[PDB]
Amino acid sequence: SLFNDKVAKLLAGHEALLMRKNEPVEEGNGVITRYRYPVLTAAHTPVFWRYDLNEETNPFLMERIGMNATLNAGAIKWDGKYLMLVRVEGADRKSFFAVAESPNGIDNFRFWEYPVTLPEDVVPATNVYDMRLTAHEDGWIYGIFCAERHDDNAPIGDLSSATATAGIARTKDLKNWERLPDLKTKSQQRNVVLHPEFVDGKYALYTRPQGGIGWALIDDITHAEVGEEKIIDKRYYHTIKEVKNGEGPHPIKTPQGWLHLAHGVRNCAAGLRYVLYMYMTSLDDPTRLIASPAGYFMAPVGEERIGDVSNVLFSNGWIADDDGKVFIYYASSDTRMHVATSTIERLVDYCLHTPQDGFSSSASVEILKNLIERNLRLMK
């Protein structure tokens, strides 16, 4: 029948999309390797999420639930597989979470047949987004995310003013999630991320109160409340992290220190511009900066530049294999998910040996002239 043929073609085209082999982009900077194709797009969502496949109730075979974007994904290595905790945004403008898995980390990502069922906390949330997964030493996988609600204090007619809390959920199988109480805090918090080890016998969170990225020790993750907050990485005038910054995924432990991936924001004539940057902190004291490479680590290139919210890169997930290979999962323009690959050694090299920002054009020129001089002497 024509209908059954149409369904068979939808499924077949979908498998071909899902199984497509990714290829590295051979032109790069020696730090990260980009890939030809996104790892996830709205089109990667299962056909059976979008279409009613029953001819009796959907004779025209049209989509019943539109999917708009797959972005800002958390990430975890799980029972030998590479997993993203994807922020999926429907056509209805709500986001929800969904696990997608790949055998190799760069392609053949496929969503689990059901998305994430996330219980509400005492106060229901309208939107949930940007989950950071932490396999904590206490044996739980924590997902720390943004829980957004309409701002009650807003003037009538204002349907846009919003408040956000740090939502805290934990799981041991990524299917059954226990919702702990929202992070209690005096200042509003976004980009909250759980450090994977106890520090002074306490849970440690990366925070962004709304100075920069902060550090807060928490006695009880099941009754989490920020008290003291220490700033780790600061905003600076005329850098890539001028207006805002925020921690991405939780940092990777290396013998040289904690390796961090964050985003920085500035304002330009086209709106806000988001890029990724890195920093390192000490193993002895994770609050202490030990590497501050100047500038951005990654910025939108090519197709990445354009989407629902253009001029944005964002990452809240990466995976480092035992052999040192690193898979960085980053969204572009709040629309799609990409992967970039590197190694711990290369990322540490980049962090340690990219000159620090001297904070002015003159300083930048002197750093550059020093490198040129060395190279010309070599090339002679």
Site for a copy of itself in 307-336 (CB under 8 A): 307-312, 334
Minimum CB distance to ligand M1P, residue 309 (Å): 4
Residues 45-64 that bind a copy of itself (CB under 8 A): 46, 48-54, 57-58, 60-64
Among 79, 139, 153, 160, binds a copy of itself (CB under 8 A): 160
Residues in contact with 100: Cβ distance below 8 Å, sequence separation at least 6, in sequence order: 40, 44, 73, 83, 84, 86, 109, 110, 111, 112
Which DSSP helix (H) or strand (E) runs through 378? helix 361-379
* Strand boundaries in the chain, DSSP class E: 67-78, 81-90, 95-102, 110-111, 127-135, 141-150, 162-171, 178-180, 193-194, 203-207, 212-218, 230-234, 244-247, 252-254, 257-268, 271-281, 289-291, 313-320, 325-332, 336-343
Q: Is 274 in the site for a copy of itself (CB under 8 A)?
A: yes
Q: How far is the CB of 197 from a copy of itself (least distance, A)?
A: 29
CB of 166 or CB of 312, closer to ligand M1P: 312
Q: Which is nearer to ligand M1P, 290 or 309 (CB)?
A: 309
CB 291 within 8 A of CB 277: no
269 makes contact with a copy of itself (CB under 8 A): yes
What kind and span of H or E run contains 114?
A: none
Number of residues that bind a copy of itself (CB under 8 A): 118
Kindly list the residues in this chain that would bind ligand M1P in the complex (CB under 6 A).
Answer: 72, 129-130, 190-191, 244, 246, 263, 265, 269, 274, 309, 312, 314, 334
**Shortest Cβ contact with ligand M1P: which residue?**
246
Segment near a copy of itself (CB under 8 A), from 133-141, 187-195, 218-226, 234-242?
234-242
Select the residue interacting with a copy of itself from 37, 90, 324, 325 (CB under 8 A). Answer: 90
Task: Provide the minimum distance between the beta carbon of 149 and ligand M1P in the complex, in angstroms, as a whole number.
Answer: 14
Q: Quote the tokens at residue 251.
A: 């940092």
* Contacts with 311 (C-beta within 8 Å, 6 or more apart), sequence order: 268, 270, 271, 272, 273, 274, 300, 305, 333
Question: Nearest approach, Cβ of 244 to a copy of itself (angstroms)?
Answer: 10
